[PDB]
């Protein structure tokens, strides 16, 4: 009964978490029987296209960063956090950065799972959403956030 | 040989850069 609730946060952590989880597990956990998340469906779709693309086109960047990075425990999480902040420390923000970052994040997570290290996925999702909404929330809320991204990227696949 | 500090730093700058440019020209027809 007090102004404070933010669907952006919940929807962000929910999507990102379910993303790395379902993507790093290879399985399918689609058992809501009540939920839907329209913006989530569209948003994810955008992430699938732009994500897969950068992964296929910029695959060299992901591999390189991971090669140098190399992670096996939550300890490095603080180091990763440092990286993120170090990149945002400049003051530049846009769909390019966000997607690029998020992408690299998921990738590293995939590897974490492949190396039997899911416990290090928690810091991954929370870290990304944390920095993004903690220091760049204004930017997201200013550009609509998720929707504005679906409009800026456009994913119309309807005929009539 | 290499230093996580420098590593993370270089990777970081590279990450922001890669993303900053990835928007200036989306290969997948921006869609």
Return d(Cα A119, Cα A58) in angstroms, integer.
Answer: 27
B15–A83 C-beta distance less than 8 A: yes
Two tokens, residue A35: 């939920």
In chain B, where are the structural domains located?
A: 1-31
For residue A127, which of A144, A148, A108 has the smallest C-alpha distance? A108
Method: NMR
Return d(Cα A20, Cα A111) in angstroms, integer.
Answer: 11
Nearest-Cα distance to chain A for B6, in Å, is 10
Number of H helices, E strands in chain A: 8, 0
In chain A, where are the structural domains located?
A: 1-153
Max alpha carbon distance in chain B (Å)? 42
Most A CBs within 10 A among B5, B6, B9, B12, hence the mutation to make, goes to B12
Give, rounded to a whole angstrom, the gap between the first and last alpha carbons of chain B: 42
Q: What does the DSSP 8-state code read for residue A157? A: -
Nearest to A83 among B2, B11, B27 (CB): B11
Nearest to A97 among B8, B16, B30 (CB): B16
With a CB cutoff of 8 Å and minimum separation 6, the contacts of A41 are none
Number of H helices, E strands in chain B: 1, 0
Q: What is the phi/psi pair of residue A34, to 5°?
A: 180, -35
Pick the CATH number of A1-153 from 3.40.50.300, 1.10.437.10, 3.30.830.10, 1.10.510.10: 1.10.437.10
**How many C-beta atoms surround the C-beta of residue A40 within 10 A?**
16
């Amino acid at each position: 009964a007090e102004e404070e609730e933010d669907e952006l946060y919940r929807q962000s952590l929910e999507i990102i978490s379910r993303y790395l989880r379902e993507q790093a597990t290879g399985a399918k956990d689609t058992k809501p029987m009540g939920r839907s998340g329209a913006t989530s469906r569209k948003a994810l779709e955008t992430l699938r296209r732009v994500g897969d693309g950068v992964q296929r086109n910029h695959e060299t960047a992901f591999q390189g960063m991971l090669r140098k990075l190399d992670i096996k425990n939550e300890d490095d999480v603080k180091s990763l956090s440092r990286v993120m902040i170090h990149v945002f420390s400049d003051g530049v923000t846009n769909w390019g950065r966000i997607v690029t970052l998020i992408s690299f994040g998921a990738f590293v997570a995939k590897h974490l799972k492949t190396i039997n290290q899911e416990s290090c996925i928690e810091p991954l999702a929370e870290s990304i959403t944390d920095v993004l909404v903690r220091t760049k929330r204004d930017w997201l809320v200013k550009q609509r956030g998720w929707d504005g991204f679906v409009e800026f990227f456009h994913v119309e696949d309807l005929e009539g | 040989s290499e230093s996580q500090e420098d590593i993370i730093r270089n990777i970081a700058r590279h990450l922001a850069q890669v993303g900053d440019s990835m928007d200036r020209s989306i290969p997948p027809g921006l869609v």
